[PDB]
Amino acid sequence: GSSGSSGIKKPMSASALFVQDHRPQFLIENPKTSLEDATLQIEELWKTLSEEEKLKYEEKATKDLERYNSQMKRAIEQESQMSLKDSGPSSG
């Protein structure tokens, strides 16, 4: 949801796909371009995109979100998420 924790491997977001989708394509055609350089450019190229353009991919991430939602049912307990709770005073 808002943020997970170590363990449950979170799914790839549309932000990653778009990259991994042009990551290799950028190399094959442009090998001289170093691994990073190739991405560094693909990243800034995704931030300049429009809303709709992104939506098209945003659906590719949500449609697969059904996975993370399943890895939560079990993580609903103190198995993946941890918190601290104090104990108040007592009474008569």
Side-chain angles (χ1 to χ4, degrees):
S2 279
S3 210
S5 285
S6 71
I8 302 168
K9 276 166 280 283
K10 294 206 270 150
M12 272 164 78
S13 283
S15 82
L17 275 52
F18 175 97
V19 181
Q20 166 270 112
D21 275 51
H22 311 167
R23 147 182 89 194
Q25 282 316 98
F26 204 99
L27 273 292
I28 286 155
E29 298 159 81
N30 325 296
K32 164 270 165 205
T33 312
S34 292
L35 187 70
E36 280 47 43
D37 189 354
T39 305
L40 272 172
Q41 273 186 98
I42 294 157
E43 280 176 283
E44 64 158 334
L45 153 72
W46 165 264
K47 295 165 209 156
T48 184
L49 282 176
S50 299
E51 207 59 63
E52 206 158 274
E53 197 88 286
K54 279 186 176 205
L55 270 286
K56 297 175 85 75
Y57 275 87
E58 297 201 63
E59 276 291 313
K60 272 166 69 85
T62 180
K63 183 177 186 283
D64 199 287
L65 196 77
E66 88 293 273
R67 188 182 280 164
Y68 189 76
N69 286 317
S70 84
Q71 274 210 99
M72 273 270 97
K73 270 45 166 167
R74 58 210 202 67
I76 293 317
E77 298 186 63
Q78 296 274 21
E79 74 156 81
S80 201
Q81 294 275 20
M82 64 90 137
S83 205
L84 278 152
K85 202 167 288 187
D86 193 50
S87 69
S90 203
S91 55

